[PDB]
Symmetry: C3
Subunit: 184 residues, 3 copies
């Protein structure tokens, strides 16, 4: 109702992009009535997307992190984010019990409809720019899409892409804030 659904703010890897637990996705979802206030950042610690080099690897330009939810708002097992520490805040960590329901934290289906025969509108997307290493001249685009995945009831997906040729740049980002209309 007014609680926080988050990933914990530690640096302990909780996310799988290319290989297992290669990244820490810090995501904090806070319910303010009909809108959800969201704060996001990413640290890649290992694998394909850890150290970006577009001189040696020119085709590594984008990747996606998917969060898939069922009818009750529980994170599905096939999401990129691990189910382990995706829960309500208890202090600096989480409560002992994994949550039953989080429908109030899901994106609104009327505002952000699933793919169908009807006309797809752009309002289910939010664009933002974060910066690698905190450097102002190293931007990367974060594209957030609501409810556009199949095999779920609700989805939040993060697409990270860049158009610059980076040479040995560690992929860890500044933080970005956005919001979206809630289901309940």
């Amino acid at each position: 109702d007014t609680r926080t659904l988050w990933t914990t703010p530690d640096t302990s890897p909780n996310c799988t992009i290319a290989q297992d637990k290669d990244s820490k996705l810090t995501l904090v979802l806070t319910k303010c009535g009909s809108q959800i206030l969201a704060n996001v950042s990413l640290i890649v610690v290992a694998g394909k997307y850890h150290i970006i080099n577009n001189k040696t690897n020119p085709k590594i330009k984008s990747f996606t992190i998917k969060l898939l939810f069922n009818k009750n708002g529980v994170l599905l097992d096939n999401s990129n984010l691990g189910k382990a520490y995706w829960n309500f805040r208890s202090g600096n960590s989480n409560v002992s019990t994994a949550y039953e329901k989080a429908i109030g934290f899901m994106p609104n289906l009327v505002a952000y409809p699933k793919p169908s025969n009807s006309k797809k509108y752009a309002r289910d997307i939010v664009y933002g720019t974060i910066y690698l290493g905190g450097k102002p001249d190293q931007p990367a685009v974060i594209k957030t899409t609501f409810n556009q995945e199949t095999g779920c009831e609700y989805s939040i997906t993060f697409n990270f892409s860049w158009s610059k040729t980076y040479e040995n740049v560690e992929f860890e980002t500044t933080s970005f804030t956005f919001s979206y209309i809630a289901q309940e």
Copy 2:
């Protein structure tokens, strides 16, 4: 009572050039002293539906105005229609039109009404939305608080672009901003 919105549907509610030619999706959530705001626009017909700058070089901007009285009631003078601007009830509105919404109005000390005194830029918020969800099609959304005359409160959205777009449908991604509330 914590949310003022246009309804999350796609039923056209806004007049830019011709009558009801657009859908302005605006949600205002009260968070104490600040109002969390989320906004997108879909133009369905008329002058600003399919943008062609190579045919029409002058069509580069337009403004949607919301004008309020002392009680925070929307005026029929505004670009957005009064019919579907109300407090949240599920995925729709309350059956009765609201009487007072001063808590949702932009703070007068922070954003003063037009007057002989100095005008500061802090009553403006700048954002970038994208047409058709395409990253290579940016358009500027300029939000201004309490800068219209003939009303007590106002939130205006100015859409502008500097790129030459050919056959591009004006339907936008969402943008989130906030402002200081009157009470």
Copy 3:
């Protein structure tokens, strides 16, 4: 009395020292929404070095920083650029009668944004944004907000204002920027 809001008040009375005493008004509003702080910021320089920007006359004037430093209790330290006099909890459009003793719930989270130490420094304690001088679209200036990266304090929120363009006689008064950060409690 509103304990869910820490602000400078939304007036235009100089409260901040960048180059000379009270040369600016920093309007900052911190609204607590559970474990996230919704923040709203703008800057008006009224006098001194950074008031009227002329980069043709003064090529090197391209940046400045406004620092807010806090102790263990979340009280603003006097060596901060922002004056303590009107940094308080909200009462109407003004502040409460007496200065606050605690505001830990408004401080940046320490696990999320750790104090300078021997550990690996992560970029997530930075929020980048762009505001505009005079409200003109062709006059951008980058606002860089960093959490808990100053030494000599327990908490800190710093605002670095910088620009790349050569501005000639431009009054440094900005549009508003909204962001959020994870709260300590």
